[PDB]
Structures are given as C-alpha cells and as structure tokens.
Design an enzyme around this catalytic site. Sequence first.
Site, PDB file in Angstrom:
ATOM      1  N   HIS A  41      48.205  72.427  55.820  1.00  0.00           N
ATOM      2  CA  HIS A  41      47.512  71.679  54.772  1.00  0.00           C
ATOM      3  C   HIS A  41      47.722  72.259  53.358  1.00  0.00           C
ATOM      4  O   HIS A  41      47.308  71.621  52.390  1.00  0.00           O
ATOM      5  CB  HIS A  41      46.017  71.434  55.071  1.00  0.00           C
ATOM      6  CG  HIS A  41      45.122  72.632  54.967  1.00  0.00           C
ATOM      7  ND1 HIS A  41      44.717  73.133  53.737  1.00  0.00           N
ATOM      8  CD2 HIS A  41      44.462  73.295  55.945  1.00  0.00           C
ATOM      9  CE1 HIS A  41      43.882  74.126  54.010  1.00  0.00           C
ATOM     10  NE2 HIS A  41      43.688  74.256  55.325  1.00  0.00           N
ATOM     11  N   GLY A 143      39.114  78.885  49.736  1.00  0.00           N
ATOM     12  CA  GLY A 143      40.162  79.882  49.529  1.00  0.00           C
ATOM     13  C   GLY A 143      40.380  80.791  50.736  1.00  0.00           C
ATOM     14  O   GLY A 143      41.344  81.569  50.768  1.00  0.00           O
ATOM     15  N   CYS A 145      41.116  79.757  53.822  1.00  0.00           N
ATOM     16  CA  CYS A 145      42.087  79.177  54.759  1.00  0.00           C
ATOM     17  C   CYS A 145      43.296  80.089  54.953  1.00  0.00           C
ATOM     18  O   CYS A 145      43.791  80.668  53.989  1.00  0.00           O
ATOM     19  CB  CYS A 145      42.512  77.781  54.314  1.00  0.00           C
ATOM     20  SG  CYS A 145      41.155  76.591  54.222  1.00  0.00           S
TER      21      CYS A 145
HETATM   22  C1  LIG Z   1      33.245  71.561  53.044  1.00  0.00           C
HETATM   23  C2  LIG Z   1      34.723  71.701  53.242  1.00  0.00           C
HETATM   24  N1  LIG Z   1      35.438  70.499  52.798  1.00  0.00           N
HETATM   25  S1  LIG Z   1      36.422  70.533  51.504  1.00  0.00           S
HETATM   26  O1  LIG Z   1      36.244  71.710  50.714  1.00  0.00           O
HETATM   27  O2  LIG Z   1      36.302  69.250  50.889  1.00  0.00           O
HETATM   28  N2  LIG Z   1      37.896  70.598  52.134  1.00  0.00           N
HETATM   29  C3  LIG Z   1      38.447  69.490  52.924  1.00  0.00           C
HETATM   30  C4  LIG Z   1      39.311  69.980  54.062  1.00  0.00           C
HETATM   31  C5  LIG Z   1      39.642  69.067  55.062  1.00  0.00           C
HETATM   32  C6  LIG Z   1      40.488  69.416  56.096  1.00  0.00           C
HETATM   33  C7  LIG Z   1      41.034  70.677  56.113  1.00  0.00           C
HETATM   34 CL1  LIG Z   1      42.185  71.085  57.350  1.00  0.00          CL
HETATM   35  C8  LIG Z   1      40.717  71.618  55.150  1.00  0.00           C
HETATM   36  C9  LIG Z   1      39.830  71.283  54.125  1.00  0.00           C
HETATM   37  C10 LIG Z   1      39.384  72.339  53.129  1.00  0.00           C
HETATM   38  C11 LIG Z   1      38.325  73.231  53.784  1.00  0.00           C
HETATM   39  O3  LIG Z   1      37.668  72.860  54.756  1.00  0.00           O
HETATM   40  N3  LIG Z   1      38.163  74.443  53.193  1.00  0.00           N
HETATM   41  C12 LIG Z   1      37.255  75.465  53.553  1.00  0.00           C
HETATM   42  C13 LIG Z   1      37.419  76.291  54.667  1.00  0.00           C
HETATM   43  N4  LIG Z   1      36.521  77.185  55.105  1.00  0.00           N
HETATM   44  C14 LIG Z   1      35.381  77.290  54.430  1.00  0.00           C
HETATM   45  C15 LIG Z   1      35.063  76.525  53.278  1.00  0.00           C
HETATM   46  C16 LIG Z   1      33.827  76.632  52.591  1.00  0.00           C
HETATM   47  C17 LIG Z   1      33.577  75.868  51.487  1.00  0.00           C
HETATM   48  C18 LIG Z   1      34.534  74.981  51.007  1.00  0.00           C
HETATM   49  C19 LIG Z   1      35.734  74.839  51.647  1.00  0.00           C
HETATM   50  C20 LIG Z   1      36.037  75.596  52.811  1.00  0.00           C
HETATM   51  C21 LIG Z   1      38.845  71.691  51.854  1.00  0.00           C
END
Ligand SMILES: CCNS(=O)(=O)N1Cc2ccc(Cl)cc2[C@H](C(=O)Nc2cncc3ccccc23)C1
Lengths: 305, 297
Positions: A41, A143, A145
């Site tokens: 991703h 950040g 990931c």
């Molecule tokens: C609440 C998370 N949703 S997001 O920030 O919109 N988003 C969408 C998304 C969708 C699919 C995949 Cl594979 C990745 C991701 C990323 C994602 O999950 N990153 C993050 C990973 N771990 C902890 C986080 C803790 C706060 C924020 C992001 C975090 C980015």
Amino acid sequence: SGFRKMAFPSGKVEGCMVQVTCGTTTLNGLWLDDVVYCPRHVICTSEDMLNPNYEDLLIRKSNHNFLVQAGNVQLRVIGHSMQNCVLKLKVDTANPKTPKYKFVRIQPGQTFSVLACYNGSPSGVYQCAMRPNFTIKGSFLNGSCGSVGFNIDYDCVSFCYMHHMELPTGVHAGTDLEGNFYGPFVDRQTAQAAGTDTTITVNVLAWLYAAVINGDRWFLNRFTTTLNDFNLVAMKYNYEPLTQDHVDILGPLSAQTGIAVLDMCASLKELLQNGMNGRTILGSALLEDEFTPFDVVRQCSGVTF
Amino acid sequence: SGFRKMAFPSGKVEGCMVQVTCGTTTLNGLWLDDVVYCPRHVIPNYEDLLIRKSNHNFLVQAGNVQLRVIGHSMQNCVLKLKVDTANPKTPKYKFVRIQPGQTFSVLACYNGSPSGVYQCAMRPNFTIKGSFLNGSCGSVGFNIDYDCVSFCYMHHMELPTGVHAGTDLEGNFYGPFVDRQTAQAAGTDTTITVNVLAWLYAAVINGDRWFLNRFTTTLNDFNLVAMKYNYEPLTQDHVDILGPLSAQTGIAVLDMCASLKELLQNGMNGRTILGSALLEDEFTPFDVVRQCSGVTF
Ligand SMILES: CCNS(=O)(=O)N1Cc2ccc(Cl)cc2[C@H](C(=O)Nc2cncc3ccccc23)C1
Ligand SMILES: CCNS(=O)(=O)N1Cc2ccc(Cl)cc2[C@H](C(=O)Nc2cncc3ccccc23)C1
Ligand SMILES: [Cl-]
C-alpha cells in the site's frame, strides 16, 4: 521470581529497519540481504485505497520512484516485485547487519515481539499475541506501517508479522513476511470489522501453571472435569475450545507442578464462575491469555516454589 | 490506537552485555569503553576479599571472545574491571540515578546473553517488580533520550517477597538494602499517584471515558483520600507535570483527581480501563506523551 510480559531483545531487528518513500507516502521496510520488504500500500494514495488495482499502480512505477533510507544513507533500488500484499525492493547493497533469519507464518494464540517504528526509526518494543480473530491488540500510530513482529529462539530471528492497518475498533491487521494476511482482511479501505474475539484458553491455562510455579495455589480446587464438559462451560464465557493438542502441549507444565491438565481446567471453570474475589494472580485481576505454554517454560524457573 | 507496556529498543545495550566469572560465580557485566561494570558480590568484607584477587582471577567473555582483565577497582557496590579492549559497540551514554515513580527498560541477561526486555518502575519502596532468575545479576535498566543511553539500574538481588533490589551504575543501592545474605525485606509499598493519573489521561486519549465526572476537588482533599488508599501524595510538581495531558484532553488535573477519588471509593464496577481491572501505575506522564506521539531512537 516474578512474571512480566517479556519481549525478545530487539537489536537484531533494529539493524534491519529502513524508511521507504513512494511519492507522498512514507512507511517502514525490513532490509534483509539485498531486499527491502514493505507493505504494497506504499504505492497507494488515500483515494486509491477504496478499490486499488495494485498491479496497475505498480506497472507505472520505476525503481527510482522508490526512495529507501537506511539511517543517513540512501539505498539505490535496482528491482521491484510484488508477492501477495508485500512489495520486495531489490537494493544495490546487502545489509551487513542481516541476522540469521526465517519467515514463519504463526497460528492464533502464538505470541511475538513487535518493534514499533516510524520513519525507519525504532521507537519501542512490546509483546503481543495473534488473537483468535486474527487481529493484534497493538500500539500503533500513523507511520507505523511496515513495523514487524518476531521471535528470537536460539539466535535466529523468525519474522512472523508485518503491520499493514488499523481496524475501526483500534485493533491491528497485517501479513506474514510472504504478504499473506492473517484473517479475512484486505489492504483496502472497505467495510471490514474484526470478528467477535475470544480468550486463548491454552494460554490462560499456561499462565495458571506459571502462578503455581511461582508459589500461588489459592484458585485450585478438589475437582476434575472431562474435556467435553470443560469446553461446554468455556464456550459460554467466549473462551476458545481446548483441543487434545492443547492438552498434550500442557503436558510438561502438568508434570512439573503435579497438577493434571483436566484438574487445572476444573480450576479455570471455577474462576470463570466466581471471579477473583479481590485477589490477584501474578499481579493481575483478569485472566491473562498472552503467554503461551512455551513462553511460560522459557520465563519461569524449572523448580516449583 | 492501543496502549502497551512498551520498552525502549534494547540493541544499544545488547552490544555491551558480557559474562563475568570469578571462581564458582557467573553473572553479567556491562562493557563500556575499556571497563566492565558488574555487582561486587561476584567475588562480607569486600576490600579484604578483593585484595586477595588478581586480574587473571576474573574471566570476562564477550560473545565468543575472552577479554583480558588488566586492572580492577571497587566503587560502592559495583566492581570495575579494566580490560585490554575498548568495546567498539559502546553507545553514547550517561550514568543517571532515578527517583521512585520513574520507569525504565530492563534487558534481562544470563551468561552475558540477553534473553528478554521489559518495562518497569522504581517502586516508592525502592524495589522493582522484575522477572529475574538465578544468573540474572548484573542485568541493567536504562532509558534512551535521543541517541544517548542513560543507565540507571544494575540488578543485585531478590528479596523474600519475590521483588528485586539493585544499584545505580555508581554502585549506590536504591533503598535501604545491602549486598549480603542477611534478613532484609521490602517496606510497605504505595501506588504512584501521578502515574495512575497519566494512565487515566492515556485511557481518555484512547476513547475510554466512562470514569469521567462533572466534579473537581482541592489538592488537600484529594491527598487526604489518597493517604487512606496507600497512594503516594500528589504534589504541585505532579500537577504541573500533568499540564500538557490536561490541555490535550480538556480535563483539569484536579478534575481527573475527582475521577480517581470515585474509582478509589467505589471501584470499577465490573468495568476495565485500557483492558485492566486495576489502576495501572507504571506509566509516567512522559511515557504517556511518548507512546501517544511516536518518539523514535
Ligand atoms: C484509522 C486508520 N485508517 S486511515 O488512517 O484512514 N488509513 C487507511 C488504511 C486503509 C488500508 C490500509 Cl492497508 C492502510 C491504511 C492506513 C492505516 O490503517 N494506517 C495505520 C496503521 N496502524 C495504525 C494507525 C493508527 C492511526 C492512523 C493510521 C494507522 C491509513
Ligand atoms: C533468593 C535469594 N537467595 S540466594 O539465591 O541464596 N542469594 C543470596 C544473595 C544475597 C545477596 C545478594 Cl547481593 C545477592 C544474592 C543472590 C540473589 O539474590 N540472586 C538472585 C537475583 N535475582 C533473582 C533470583 C532468583 C532466584 C534465586 C536468586 C536470585 C543469591
Ligand atoms: Cl504458531
């Protein structure tokens, strides 16, 4: 004496952490030999995440679109390929700090250490377990990931997890190091919810044997149970079924303490019915399920108090 | 999201761990530059026992390499073994003495080989609730600030209750303990109040707000209640230190104190806070800010 949630020393993994940038996205990669492994991703925008066609997004990239930083040194990408949900970036320098390692896919109930990283820089280490619903209850911010999970039994690092995403409940989902997700999850921003979670029964039993080894027996009773009757009661508290494999795996702890597995099962049944009544077990007021039978044998003394 | 008991990455400390053998005793040492630091009990009248030893009596092993001891001296309860090779992996470091309530990471070692890393706190009674077996003596506690390792603890002994006692890296014990086989016990312990409040703020940051209420309290009334539940007194310094978390969540420190008072008098009533049924006191205000901000090393 004592019983702590203990993680493996992280040094062998710290020397592999790098920063991977593709356009506007920055995340962590694992540099082993001349390959950097990271979540695929990294090639996506936030818009792309709804229905990304990774093969279509990747074909438009060249090696020089991927910026890889190892400390203060820029690594040159000389090849790239996708394997399931991980991107493998061939670099022109082999990591001199590459430890002895294996890629292992774990089962629910297994524990591992996580080295949480941001911008290719390690910030912390903690111990956790693959939940029965295939999620992990981690501590990750944006950040993180590409942060990895591992075990280090006998100087060899076994990489078992790469962090990909956070689910709506605050729990985390990811893949093994071959890019296969744990659970029915996709690296897509779609309606995905963690399934109802359950308690890892074989781990709670291991932790009750650890309390006995450390000198505590208040929770034991004069009863025994059949495996079937124990499972009928356990399912009523959202506990995972205990299989004959679990009973076999608890054999060594049963011989060390002198308490039969089905006698410890009877004690667990009673704890579920009564609660702890103001008491604790190894400094905890809840039944702990993130220590495997193997973790208990590794941490605890070989002599019962 | 999430809240874990997180330790500092241990790599900079792993590259300093060595095995020290003197006669029949084997324990761990910390190799920094050309000196190996270890508990003096590896050799009681310690000056009399030490005068009878020569450099060659101390066997020091760094991985598969035998280090040559060329000098020895004692500083308080720590033995300093001058070796003929400087540690090429010596990080930027300081020796710091911590106060009760402060937290640190412990790299538990056996035979100079690191086996695990965990996070813990210096209790108000100066003991640590660690996880150590025989052979763990010489294991060290540390924090990292930027790229500098601050060594704050060296493990020396286990007390009858299963808790641990040790020294700073200058050999001064934390607590009224002595390095010898005699009747010693941990004093009555108390809960680290400023840490419980920091953990309550971490819970609010993570969406756990059921314990919040409309009430406030004075610092004096809070301390009168806290003294009854074996909680450490909360000082104005603690209130000042919790300032940033109070501004981030919008809950005044004395407003959160009223929540803590109600939890102390009425309990959790079948509920949990950050997956715990007890009030957690091993996260400092700084640990909460660091874990909910992503500080790297
Ligand atoms: C609440 C998370 N949703 S997001 O920030 O919109 N988003 C969408 C998304 C969708 C699919 C995949 Cl594979 C990745 C991701 C990323 C994602 O999950 N990153 C993050 C990973 N771990 C902890 C986080 C803790 C706060 C924020 C992001 C975090 C980015
Ligand atoms: C239970 C302690 N009694 S002992 O084994 O005879 N003993 C006496 C002693 C006296 C003074 C000093 Cl400075 C050190 C020590 C050593 C000591 O505390 N080592 C140990 C340290 N940590 C965990 C242990 C877990 C099991 C055993 C020892 C452990 C050794
Ligand atoms: Cl497994």
